[PDB]
Amino acid sequence: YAGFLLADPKIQEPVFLVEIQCPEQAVGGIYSVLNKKRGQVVSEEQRPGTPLFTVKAYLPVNESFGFTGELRQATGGQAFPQMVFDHWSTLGSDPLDPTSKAGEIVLAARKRHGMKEEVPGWQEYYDKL
Amino acid sequence: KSTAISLYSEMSDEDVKEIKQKTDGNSFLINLIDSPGHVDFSSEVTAALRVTDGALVVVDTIEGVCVQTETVLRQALGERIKPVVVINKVDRALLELQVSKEDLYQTFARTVESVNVIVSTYADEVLGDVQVYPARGTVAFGSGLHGWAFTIRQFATRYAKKFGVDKAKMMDRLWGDSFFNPKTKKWTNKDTDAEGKPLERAFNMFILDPIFRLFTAIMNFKKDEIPVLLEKLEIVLKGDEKDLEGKALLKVVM
Amino acid sequence: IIEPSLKALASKYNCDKSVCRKCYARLPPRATNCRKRKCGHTNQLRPKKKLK
Amino acid sequence: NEVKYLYLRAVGGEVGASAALAPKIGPLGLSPKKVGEDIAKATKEFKGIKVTVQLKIQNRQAAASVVPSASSLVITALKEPPRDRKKDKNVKHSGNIQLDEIIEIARQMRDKSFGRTLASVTKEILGTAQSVGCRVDFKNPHDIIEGINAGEIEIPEN
Amino acid sequence: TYMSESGEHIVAGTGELHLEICLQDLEHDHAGVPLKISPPVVAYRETVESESSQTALSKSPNKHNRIYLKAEPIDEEVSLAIENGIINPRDDFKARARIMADDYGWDVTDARKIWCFGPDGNGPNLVID
Amino acid sequence: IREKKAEYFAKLREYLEEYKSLFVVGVDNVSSQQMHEVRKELRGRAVVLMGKNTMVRRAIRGFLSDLPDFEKLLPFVKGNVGFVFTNEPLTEIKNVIVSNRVAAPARAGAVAPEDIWVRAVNTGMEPGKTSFFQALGVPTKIARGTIEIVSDVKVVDAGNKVGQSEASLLNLLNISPFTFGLTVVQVYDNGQVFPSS
Amino acid sequence: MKYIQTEQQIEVPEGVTVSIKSRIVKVVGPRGTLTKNLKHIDVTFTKVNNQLIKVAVHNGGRKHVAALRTVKSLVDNMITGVTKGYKYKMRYVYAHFPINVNIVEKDGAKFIEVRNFLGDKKIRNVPVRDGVTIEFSTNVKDEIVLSGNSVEDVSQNAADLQQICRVRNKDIRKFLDGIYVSHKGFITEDL
């Protein structure tokens, strides 16, 4: 418990791999949409004979609620998603600082877990000697 | 829900002899499932799509070929399903836009050319000829709400009973560059300016003309025009349904 | 729908306008100064946002 | 017979992906792998450096041909190790390629140039090289134009 | 429909309204009893993103024993190997360490002194003596 | 400012005293690349330089003492005219300038010169552009995965300007109702001017 | 500033005769006679040769002298307004519902009818001022013809149908429907 809290603790969140069968005009929203929900473009492709793309992307599960509808709302219903979890990404922001970017979900995790308000720092769990 | 419904239709020799199908008998039995078209019910239809070989893709003329229309139509073509295309809500197009003779003809062309692009873009290379053609009789026009529609092949026969006209090639004559050329009685293939007063098409001249004239009687509630044309129109009425006004007289007559 | 030429014709009157920071009126020809006295004929203009 | 014509920015000597060809060449009924194979063959010795790839289709034959590019060809000559995307961002380029090397390419360029004199073509082609910012013969590329204007780099217009 | 890793029945559906009407059956048509709805919580993972700048110390309740440890960010490839069976807990020492030392660069000696895998004996958390 | 125009005055003087004969090039509707290809071809043969009509008109006034011949051609110097000095056979120079043409595309706004036709031709075009074809209201049909026109139609009349949509359709089929190139109105030769024709 | 003398010229073509009182301007031509009252302007008219009229203001300021050219535009528009006329072509703009236009009479006022605009059931009746003509002209779909001698009269009414048909509490950038001025020219073609 002590040793974890001295080595720059971080939290890692699961990442979907999402691939989209979308036509040409509506793909532009995805690049706009993803950077508003931290989505990451992996690769673009088009099926031979049809004009629709097939574009693969990484979206953290965090920003993945209601995502298709706004994708449906942004694309006029023309884009169609296929959704699957791929891997985990590490949060760049500190999850120890209560006012940090990762420090709100963990505080919410404290809210849903019943734990204290303060997060255990490395000062506790460690007998200084 | 997607439940099959039973539908039974007898028919006479002239229309069963004119059937290019591997089959035998005089009876046809139609089993139809009404899947809901909501795109978020895309799984109730994908099971529903598989169970059949023909699919009735209903398309609205006002909104045109919409986004979800394309999607399920591509889904049907994924299974190699032969489609029949029916456009509803002509009454909407004939009462909201009031497109008189050519715009209605042109708008139909817009959609059918649009859908023909889709079937030519998504025809699998085992059938090839899944293309839809109003000339081939796979496209109808009518009002689902009011419960009336027509087919060119059904309409193609109605004329030789009074003109003695050929049937084989007039079914594909109703579309494209071919013009009835009234005042001359010749199915010309170009306007040619008619030496002045450029001449009309057979489609506009023959089929839509009675339709729009009846509306003028009906949609303005013109009591003086109903009885004369209906007798020319070889239809019958009932003892009491004659006494119905516009937007409801139209329903029963067609 | 509207044919593109007619759409441009109408938008020249409906969208191709400017706005004063202070008085919000839709009255440029191409103006550099507002015509209203409530804004004091101020020169602070923006082009009216074009849809999408 | 349709002579279909296209360009690329595929990097030399590194197999060009069909993923930038399948959108374009895929529609025109072509096996991507074999037509792509032609691209790699046309780009063999150009290893490391992007260059545009002329491609002439004479009835479904991918005759790709690297357009010899002033920027690209000079950078090949610098001897700097072929840049891999991963390796480093915006690697600068400083090969000491001689001015005499340039005039050979200028003779490769006058057909695609407009200068009255062959020296004027050198002004142009170095002007493209001037964009790149690489060093040439331990001197400012711009002064070569001025030096040429000063009658110093006399070009054998033949 | 299925259960999350934290013991909450996580129903899945096509779109936002589809959940409404399908659930609308539950209280009224399908099940017939009123229940509540909440967004499913995303299960995070905790890790380090540094190399344990300061050495961890802890004292036993009797203070006779002391433990000195280090924390290090095991890389994703080892994590990928662990979860995909490349590094098998059931395998024995002098064989399990060979592949990951050979194909992941680890040191011969340290990889031999693996005490256990955690949690559950096959997780991605590791102890090195 | 003044120096360059005097420099231009000097530049005209030099050509005025280096080429006995010249062409009066009509520069109506000349694009920029078309100029580049022309000056590529005339290399060695001719020189091309045009400029301000007033500067050209003013410069000769200071040159008229040495060059009083150019008086006769001035009332032919009207509008878009330039100067092409050369000492090469009459027939050859005229044809090559007026032979090399460019099938100039139709940009939206340009007046339709004459009635444009669309013919029942096989487009050989990928179907995706059918929407573009539909936009102009062209009856179309898909055979061999390309659009094919059903009927010949006079799209627009002679006169009325080509709209944006029409310009889009013409550009797609490489149809271009515009032929653009360098013209020549007059010819000055050893102090004897006559129309080019 | 106060220019001592500033004037503009007003060409009189062959078919125009101008009767000018103190401020009562009367232009007489082939198609009729136009009259306007300018008692608000304080200008000075002078006939030079029956074919040029010089209008000058003495000791006029920037505010004062600017309106003089306004008068010349006013008189010139009268001159061309009685000779070439002023014609306004009006185009119907509609996305789904075509705007239904009629000509109707109420107490003998030549009311122009707008029905079914945006599907609305109300009747727009706009009186036609004297001298302005309404024509529905073929060969351009859904366009009416607004013609009359005086530019002020035609454009005020040509505009007024535009304002009654503006969309409320809606994004006008998407609802382009309306009846919009298409051309402002002269009744005589190329003249």
Added chain:
RNA sequence: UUCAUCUAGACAGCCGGACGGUGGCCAUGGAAGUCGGAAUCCGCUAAGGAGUGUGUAACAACUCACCGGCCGAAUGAACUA
């Protein structure tokens, strides 16, 4: 008040060109004038920025500086109270 442009045609106005090298170096999945870091080069030049905006995901298709056709005498910009 200052600084300018100006019959060797000032400004406004209607029209044309607004190239090629050139998808300038590189990046981002892709970037081609325009998410950006970078150089502000050369030829033809009547003149054109490795680009002022519309613009696509990129393309592309438009467009402006820049300069030229038509008219003719003044005009521009920044500051003062």
